[PDB]
């Protein structure tokens, strides 16, 4: 079994620093790139920073660059987000979460901890939910719809749009509530060892579809897309998938 654990999560006050580390077993740690992902609470995924198989190149959104500091420690089996001057706004849920090299999909993801930046004087400074998609000069994801009614056995199609070409380097993730995101298609349709193969995906370019051939009633969940072409890596803003 691959193995993700991640440590560290807890109330912290803004402008103070935590430490979060992800043990690794189960795989050849220095063999792969390494993402940390967030949650903000009843909100979608947003990508934070990634480091390559040797920690030589890191990479960082830019709402955390200078405050967050990646780094791996390939003899212990251990991967680190430093985070220094936190903010009301970094509140979320942190997932680690590895890197394959080929196609760029985060194919084992942790279970995740959750980091609470709070004085107490409300939860306005959170700002909400942030602007899902990609921001500044990220390749945009639009997903669609946002939300939609169905029920068992019927045929659902999911979409999503990116700004630029991305090949097929584009991923598909089941969220149910309150559990980690899954991989379901890399490569924009491949499908990821164990998934039933009621899912499909297919598109290059900048058009993807996923597909499930006959809604079953745990598919109720909320989906991802996911660009895996370049850094900040992108996600979707998420269909939910609900019954009617």
Known sequence: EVQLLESGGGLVQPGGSL????????????????????????????????????????????????????????????????????????????????????YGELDFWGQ?????????????????????????????????????????????????????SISSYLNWYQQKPGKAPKLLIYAASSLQSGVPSRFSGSGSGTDFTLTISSLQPEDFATYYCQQSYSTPLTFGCGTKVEIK
Request: glycine share 16%.
């Open 112 to 164: 995740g901890t959750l980091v609470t930046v709070s004085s107490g004087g409300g939860s306005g400074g959170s700002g909400g939910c942030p602007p899902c998609g990609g921001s500044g000069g990220d390749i945009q994801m639009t997903q669609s719809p946002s939300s939609l009614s169905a029920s068992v056995g019927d045929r659902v199609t999911i979409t999503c749009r990116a700004s630029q």
């Open 19 to 102: 430490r979060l580390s992800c043990a690794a077993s189960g795989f050849t740690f220095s063999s792969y790139a390494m993402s940390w992902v967030r949650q903000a609470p009843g909100c979608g995924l947003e990508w934070v920073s990634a480091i390559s198989g040797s920690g030589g190149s890191t990479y960082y959104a830019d709402s955390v660059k200078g405050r967050f500091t990646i780094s791996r420690d390939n003899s212990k089996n251990t991967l680190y987000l430093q985070m220094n001057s936190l903010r009301a706004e970094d509140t979320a849920v942190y997932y680690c979460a590895k890197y394959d090299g080929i």
